[model samples]
Target: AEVYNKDGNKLDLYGKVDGLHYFSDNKDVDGDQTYMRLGFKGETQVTDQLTGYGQWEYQIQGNSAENENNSWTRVAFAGLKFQDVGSFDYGRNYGVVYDVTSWTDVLPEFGGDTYGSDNFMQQRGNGFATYRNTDFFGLVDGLNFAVQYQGKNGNPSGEGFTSGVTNNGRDALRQNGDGVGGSITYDYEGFGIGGAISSSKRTDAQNTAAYIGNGDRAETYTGGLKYDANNIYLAAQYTQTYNATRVGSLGWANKAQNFEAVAQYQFDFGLRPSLAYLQSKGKNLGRGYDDEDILKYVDVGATYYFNKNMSTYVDYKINLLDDNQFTRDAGINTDNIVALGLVYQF
Candidate 1:
């Protein structure tokens, strides 16, 4: 909603609160899954050809107890945009590789398993500097491109790091050196195609890990296609990650291949149904694990909308992973899940 719009300055607020619950055999994820997100965006016209903008977004876990740390910033960035040119920004933001993955990442909830946050040049992370140009600087009809850089972040010191290639036994796989990435895309009459690639130097600890790697760098390459016309949406993508994809808290993949696809259709009477499939296979992982399917699932979901700001959804996750000794040892979840959610957005 636009709260302020006077002079050259504009402010808008948008967020969502989802009351969610999961039914699953897995004990870890079988309970309350509620959360809330809030964000603000602002823009100001600096001149006839220049504009300044900023945004901040945060997520809060409603299931947390009193006094527990339940919130974190999802995005915080400021940038300048020049008309018919491009835009530049710095601070916490999404990595460039997500440009292609985002096309197939709309399954109501839970997908995008191939890449994620805290891994350099893949998903959202800190210390990102981004430059984006749309419509090829006003010379092309439907072309866009982006270039991004992420500074070296130190090893994570939190809970899920104890077993992986660790600096002092803390999973150092999340830590990465300076990195660079870019993506290019084109669209025509509701059809779109895109690709992206990124490479980053691995941390000292990551390169010294035994079976996982002794490599010098981590890299990812990806491409995707999508269509969104006539109330129908379809998207698919393929990706490859080398030493850049984390398998478990204690392991990294020497190489991995991932695929994702989704299909959705919205009806005129306010019902939208969705279907999607995603999987990732890790090769040459730690402890003699080879060609392991670390993640695999099919999602079936539907949402009934009462209006623009209120809706309810039901999503079922069909887990396709085989539960075995290797999967158990790797901390992979192989149980199916179903979630019921009610959302209010603004």
Candidate 2:
């Protein structure tokens, strides 16, 4: 079930099985029953004041009750940590920009609007290593800071994408360069607050790619606050990023922003009620290139505790999106999601 080293090392193996009953009024789809996932984490002390850690996770994705597409997603990297200095990590994981975006919500299960929406600015891009500092300034006991870097390495552009072109020389869209990011956080007594700043180089077309960009670079900053006490919880966050001009290159310079807030109250009967809201907007630097987008989401849910090791939950969500420039390609959107699932630890 669990193991630990006499020298400060630890390992954990865990898994969960979930059942679902979902119906979309859209009539195109209806689904029901069981999903599963498993994961492992290992951490070892390298020295009296340092440690190394790594983790891997896999989940089944499909339609049949038997489950299909047994796929795996790497969560974090093997990295070293200094007892009081900080940490250095490398491998496939979330980008610093995206990590801060996660602070706005308490529940972020798969298929939730926060994770399923491509425009949520919540994806972890692959590549690079990071340096994080603990006890930053020593102002707050658990406060820390971090910085991450990724290099170009002369990789071609658009490596694994379908460009719809004949013969192209682009390698893999990495296009040599670097990404720099950092964050600062403080948590104590059930209250948490923090923010992060990041900038990247490469062609503009790959704005989401962090690694490749047209010489021009883009920047993003995010800040969040959360409070949880006595069965009540609340969270709010804001993030903004600059987009470049041009198609293939880092494209034009634009401004984009996101805002979200949530509140939840728990009942003695293992039930919970929640409310949430989210909005997004974008504007370009060049004349006539201005565009704007927005999304509003709300959810209500409950959780039932079977014991310390097991629980079941069901939730419902409503989503709406509005856009002025890409109405057809990015049409107005709305959805209702309902699911009942179980979570267990071993």
Candidate 3:
């Protein structure tokens, strides 16, 4: 993390990497980790009341396609920050919906997709500028707001006039697109509450989609509340998406309202126990529905801290997706997963 003086000048550099291992009864055991990333961020004084700031981060891995190993994974971007007028950012950035939901709790890997009713996918998209406000009105304090706008940089493949084109090319589902989203968060006394909403429309609404590559005009909304005290934490979130479509028709299978919760406790003895539950209900949204889907999981995890810079963790998880129709299509089943991992940080 970094901060700047009042003059719109560069400030500091900070970085961190989160690593993990996973084993599942449905698939082979896997140990996967993202490349280490270095980030630089700071603020400069533009005026007495106005300031400017931005951030840039580069992953150690290379391009996604060429990097069989952990090559230079390209998660890089820059943005501008303002003191009271809200911040405006340009570059490859995260969707406001994704940002708010991930703040609740995510398990890594498939965790990204499970957020927000499991209606939208995760990660940052390209060619967009975003705006965010920390807390304009002191209305109760510890509250923040953020919004994002995605412009028409380039159309996704097989969309618009490019229909009937080959899908072998890159940027298959991300057509020229645009979107807007915002979030409101409040935190005080180790307790936090947040809510986020976003909507997007692909220029080729009839041809391409944005996050999940299913429809042109897609949208999601999510809300969560959390409490953190000493070594204990508890959180719950509800998410939903509308106008879910696939190819050209409504994707009743994907339209959903989901809920998830988590509870964790860290012991002075270096052991942490955690549990999470997630469920979703599929609806047609006046389009007439045929199926209802629900998926859930329970996980127990423990971590031992050798010191401030080193730690190890072991976890076991069991999943239950009740609707076989949707679970089979999603290629996920009720199963168990176990993992052990270590980390060293400075």
Candidate 4:
């Protein structure tokens, strides 16, 4: 909420506290998912046509041990905007590919499984320099675009990774070199369509460990369409990643093809039902010539809003995966799960 407003300065706070639990046979993802996110955003009018803005957000894992490192910054960025011209920002932020994947990533829980964080430029990561423009600099109606650059992120050690992870820190699979990406979208009434692509050089370490997608660079391409009018919402997206997607922290997927779609309806009385399907297949990572299913599931859920600030929900994942030896070896969970949650947001 707006906490400060004076002269030409404004400050606001936004985030959420969620208490969640999962019931499933899979021990890896069967328990607490509780967390809290806190953020602050502020802006100062620098001049008649310029403004300065920044945001800082942090996430805390409530399920962690008392002395453990349970908190980390999710977003930290600052930028300047020149009226209808555009805005430029640098720091940890979302990758351009999210501009389209976000279309179907609305299932409150268990929705946005098609991508990963800190794995190149699919979601959020550090060292992103982004330039964004809206409505074609106020000329075109309902058109938006963004161009982004990402400095090479360092090789993250196997801190939070599973024990099955490899590369021995030196050849960590998640590290990437410099990269560039862009996104474009257009909207008419409630209909929207968008696409984004990213290409980044692979680090020397990652290349050494790249058994599947062994390339000098990592690339991702995605397209999505959505409709959000009336009380109904629908979104569909298709994405492909080369040398940029991880297979459960085990190794890099040579190629990943993903599809996701969601349908939701919001009732005026404060109830919303959601249905969604997601599948991510890893290609050329095996010997038998079959694509390994990294993630495949259908979600059914509903949220009951007590008010704008509070809500409760339950999401069930109809796991459509096989509990085969390869999946088990890769540490992929194949059991169905039901997630229940309560949240307070502001």
Candidate 5:
């Protein structure tokens, strides 16, 4: 909801609560899952050509264990905008790479794992400054661009190493490293295309050792296209990661190439059905695998919206391949994921 003041200032309060039951053969054996988020945002028009904005969001997990509390800040940022030039924001926010990767990351419960959206490729980084322009020049319409830079020690104060660091008490001013990325997208009618690239460098030797032995440099490139028309949506994306470790279940892989596709159709009756496929090949040093190891999955799901603010969904994900040695050694085997969820937004 939002309230507008006489001076063209606005305050917005928004939140989403998602309750879900997740079942997987490989993890979360208890079948417990639920999450919620809260956010507050505001904007003020300083002049006809300029404005100021700020936002903050937090996530809460409902099923934490007895001794653990699951809650943390998701994003917090404040920025300024110039009417015809661009906008600049500073603080924690999604990396510019997501500008293209999001095309295939729309699945209800899958599709983001291998494509640099959730791992060391930089999903969200702290101490970042981003600039975005919706109109490239007076010559072209529907063209947008964004660039971001993250300082080595830009992490939030007192937050510690949520992104990949081991020491929480390290000096905030120490030279940790830096990252830079940018993306460009064009959209007209129902068709859109975009690409993004990012690179990061770590100065702290200790932080560099937490992942791969490949020094402290990691990079990624991604491109995607999507069309949304006639009640159907189709998207495809390709991504490559170099010298970066995948996080979570696939953390052992140091380099990866990924391709993903998604298709969804929304019926007039408020029901949407979707299908997604992902294939990723990764390499880990000394695993002795001549060929790149492979991981693949297929996801099918449907959502029914009761209204604009409420919806429910059910998703099933199947693992098609898991031949990577690191996966095998970690005991990560074929286990499908079944999830049911309800979401309410305001």
Candidate 6:
């Protein structure tokens, strides 16, 4: 796990390979898939109160053919830390909005995709600089904060555009703008509360579409509360997206609101049972869709941890409401998804 050198520096290697067998009533057996992640990190002491550190990580689609280009760099960052102050890092990293959304994003299979994250903003961004502080004012026992800023970058040709919005033959990523976001959280004796917000320019809307008039920016705000004690965890969160519209996408409109709640309990036999619920609604204003359409789902699962490094789980997701435009247009009669997965970490 760690190796020490003569130069007073330390190095560590870490990774995990997880595989899942997913089945859906609509899609049938999708076969086995693997997610592999690897990372190398190091640190060296500069002084009594300061240190320098760096980390690099890569992700691989292990189920792909061996000769295919299935790997990509996920993180590459370096920074400095001061004992009494904070740390500053520059590179690619997770957006600050995840700090709060992570509270209810813990489902074993589904729920995260429907939370308005992918359609609005990315979970990770390139050209990002981040700062974290753990002892703000020293006022509370467990208070911390994080902030991040991302520079304009090129969006992939056809992938990053919002569903209904497109940048007529233009490079959406190149036309994108910068963004800034932050989060603050506090935890004391198993109770926690946090919130995050982000604002950035929209790239999918150029001069091409009439409906895209004046809708040039997107913003997201989320807040959550949680309690974890006695082998039980409960959490609830609310997320809202503004001006992030994409037709044929669930909850993508002028304004979208998402709510989620989760509860999990771990038994003495290494079995954990969990349940989650998510509800989403969107208002399109002048757009054609009705205002009352809603997308709702429930997730239930159980995980059995055989050891610290190995676990298996079975998760089922049910779509409670099928009135959303996206679902209706897709003719999705089957609304249940079942997944079984195993993970080993080292």
lDDT of 4 by residue, 1-346 (tens): 9999999999999999999999999888989999999999999999999999999999988888887877989889999999789999998889989988988989978888777777788888878999999998799989999999998765545667543333423345556688999999999999999999999988766665435567888899999999999999999999999878877756777899999999999999999999999999988875453578889999999999999899999999999998887787777788999999999999
Q: Is 1 or 3 the stronger prediction by TM-score?
A: 1
lDDT of 3 by residue, 1-346 (tens): 3454443476666554546656765653444543456777666676776666666666664222553655332344555555556677776666676655665464423443453222222246655567777766444467788767766544335555444333322343333345777888888989988888877664443342332334556667788888889988888888876543221222323477767777778788776767777666666433233445545676666677777767777767666655454455444455777777666555
Question: Of the candidates numbered 2 and 4, which has the greater lDDT value?
Answer: 4
Candidate 2 TM-score, C-alpha based: 0.76
Candidate 3 similarity to native, TM-score: 0.74
User: Quick one: how many clashes does candidate 3 have?
Assistant: 18
Residue-wise lDDT of candidate 2 within 12-123, one digit each (tens)? 8877766666656634334664567788789887778877889777667544645446555646578887776777888656656555566655553322222221111234
**TM-scores for all candidates?**
0.94, 0.76, 0.74, 0.93, 0.86, 0.83
- Which model is ahead, 4 or 5, in terms of TM-score? 4
Task: Give candidates' CA RMSD values in order.
Answer: 3.4, 5.7, 5.4, 3.9, 4.1, 4.5
Off by over 4 Å in 4: 156-171, 209-211, 287-289
lDDT of 1 at 274: 98
Better of 1 and 5 by lDDT: 1
Local distance difference test, each candidate: 0.87, 0.59, 0.58, 0.87, 0.74, 0.71
Candidate 6 TM-score versus the reference: 0.83
TM-score of 4: 0.93
- lDDT assessment of candidate 1: 0.87
Give the range of the ten consecutive residues with the poorest summed lDDT in model 2: 112-121
Tens digit of per-residue lDDT, candidate 5, span 129-159: 8999977744578899998887665343456
Alpha carbon deviation, residue 116, candidate 3 (Å): 9.1
Runs of candidate 2 exceeding 4 Å displacement: 1-9, 27-34, 62-70, 108-122, 137-140, 152-177, 204-215, 244-253, 285-290, 322-328
Worst 10 residues of 6 by lDDT: 165-174
lDDT of 4 at 137: 78
Candidate 2 overall Cα lDDT vs. reference?
0.59
